Design an enzyme around this catalytic site. Sequence first.
Site, mmCIF file in Angstrom:
data_model
loop_
_atom_site.group_PDB
_atom_site.id
_atom_site.type_symbol
_atom_site.label_atom_id
_atom_site.label_comp_id
_atom_site.label_asym_id
_atom_site.label_seq_id
_atom_site.Cartn_x
_atom_site.Cartn_y
_atom_site.Cartn_z
ATOM 1 N N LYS A 7 -11.643 3.951 8.105
ATOM 2 C CA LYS A 7 -10.118 3.683 8.141
ATOM 3 C C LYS A 7 -9.450 4.696 7.423
ATOM 4 O O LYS A 7 -8.704 5.177 8.137
ATOM 5 C CB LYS A 7 -8.958 2.264 8.569
ATOM 6 N N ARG A 10 -11.390 8.243 6.695
ATOM 7 C CA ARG A 10 -10.051 8.741 8.733
ATOM 8 C C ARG A 10 -9.030 8.994 8.317
ATOM 9 O O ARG A 10 -8.702 10.471 8.484
ATOM 10 C CB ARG A 10 -10.891 8.374 9.581
ATOM 11 N N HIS A 12 -6.626 8.914 5.124
ATOM 12 C CA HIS A 12 -6.329 9.684 4.165
ATOM 13 C C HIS A 12 -7.101 10.992 3.628
ATOM 14 O O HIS A 12 -6.843 11.607 2.438
ATOM 15 C CB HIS A 12 -6.022 8.771 3.228
ATOM 16 N N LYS A 41 1.973 8.665 14.356
ATOM 17 C CA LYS A 41 2.140 7.868 12.791
ATOM 18 C C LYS A 41 3.175 9.139 12.023
ATOM 19 O O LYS A 41 2.833 9.955 12.132
ATOM 20 C CB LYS A 41 0.558 8.589 12.563
ATOM 21 N N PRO A 42 4.208 7.793 11.886
ATOM 22 C CA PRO A 42 5.517 8.705 11.397
ATOM 23 C C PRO A 42 5.536 9.220 10.163
ATOM 24 O O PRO A 42 5.510 10.256 9.729
ATOM 25 C CB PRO A 42 6.080 7.064 11.172
ATOM 26 N N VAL A 43 4.161 8.728 9.001
ATOM 27 C CA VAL A 43 4.528 9.089 7.719
ATOM 28 C C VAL A 43 2.158 8.959 7.772
ATOM 29 O O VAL A 43 1.913 8.125 7.425
ATOM 30 C CB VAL A 43 4.726 8.472 6.693
ATOM 31 N N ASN A 44 2.101 9.964 7.183
ATOM 32 C CA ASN A 44 0.872 9.689 6.569
ATOM 33 C C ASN A 44 0.234 10.929 5.318
ATOM 34 O O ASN A 44 0.702 12.224 5.564
ATOM 35 C CB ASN A 44 -0.259 9.764 8.005
ATOM 36 N N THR A 45 -0.526 10.326 4.577
ATOM 37 C CA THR A 45 -1.011 11.555 3.329
ATOM 38 C C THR A 45 -2.276 11.469 3.286
ATOM 39 O O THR A 45 -3.464 10.799 3.671
ATOM 40 C CB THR A 45 -0.443 10.471 1.847
ATOM 41 N N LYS A 66 3.911 -1.384 -3.298
ATOM 42 C CA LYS A 66 5.293 -1.207 -3.031
ATOM 43 C C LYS A 66 5.071 -2.977 -2.647
ATOM 44 O O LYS A 66 6.266 -3.311 -2.751
ATOM 45 C CB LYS A 66 5.685 -0.447 -1.927
ATOM 46 N N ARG A 85 4.717 13.674 7.295
ATOM 47 C CA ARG A 85 5.865 13.192 8.399
ATOM 48 C C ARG A 85 6.666 13.724 9.331
ATOM 49 O O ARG A 85 7.174 15.450 9.685
ATOM 50 C CB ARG A 85 7.517 12.713 7.367
ATOM 51 N N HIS A 119 -6.468 1.466 1.695
ATOM 52 C CA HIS A 119 -5.102 1.897 1.813
ATOM 53 C C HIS A 119 -4.745 2.948 1.055
ATOM 54 O O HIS A 119 -4.617 2.837 -0.195
ATOM 55 C CB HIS A 119 -4.295 0.517 2.165
ATOM 56 N N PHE A 120 -3.248 3.565 1.866
ATOM 57 C CA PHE A 120 -2.916 4.499 0.861
ATOM 58 C C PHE A 120 -1.422 3.722 0.096
ATOM 59 O O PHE A 120 -0.657 3.923 1.340
ATOM 60 C CB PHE A 120 -2.976 5.863 1.159
ATOM 61 N N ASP A 121 -1.090 3.505 -1.083
ATOM 62 C CA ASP A 121 0.144 2.960 -0.879
ATOM 63 C C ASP A 121 1.325 4.344 -1.439
ATOM 64 O O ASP A 121 2.043 3.506 -0.337
ATOM 65 C CB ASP A 121 0.148 2.270 -2.514
#
EC number: 4.6.1.18
Length: 124
Positions: A7, A10, A12, A41-45, A66, A85, A119-121
């Site tokens: 995930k 996919r 990031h 998706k509100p925010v993604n990097t 965080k 965003r 996960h992307f912090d």
Amino acid sequence: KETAAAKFERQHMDSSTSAASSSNYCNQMMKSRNLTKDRCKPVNTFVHESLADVQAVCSQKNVACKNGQTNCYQSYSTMSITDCRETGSSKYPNCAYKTTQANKHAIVACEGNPYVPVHFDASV
Ligand SMILES: [Cl-]
Ligand SMILES: [Cl-]
């Protein structure tokens, strides 16, 4: 079902390009990676480095996340990163994103064996 590792890849990973080409980048990418299927998706990097290099960050600088978890890692050097965003006029299913390109250190959370990004912090 989808594993955490898969995930993250996919959501990031984007080694096909060296950086965010245009302002529409985030639009078609959030789409092609299925981040707009059921919701916007509100925010993604997106990280524009090789998977190998991103996975290696799991063995770089150990920083807190965080949320407070102690399993986050920051990359020693900067990386090509694209932030996506939702804009003010973004509404499902017509999601609209502002594409912002830059080179910063990536911070991810790693877990499991093999120990890889799950996960992307954030990005500094
Ligand atoms: Cl993200
Ligand atoms: Cl190296």
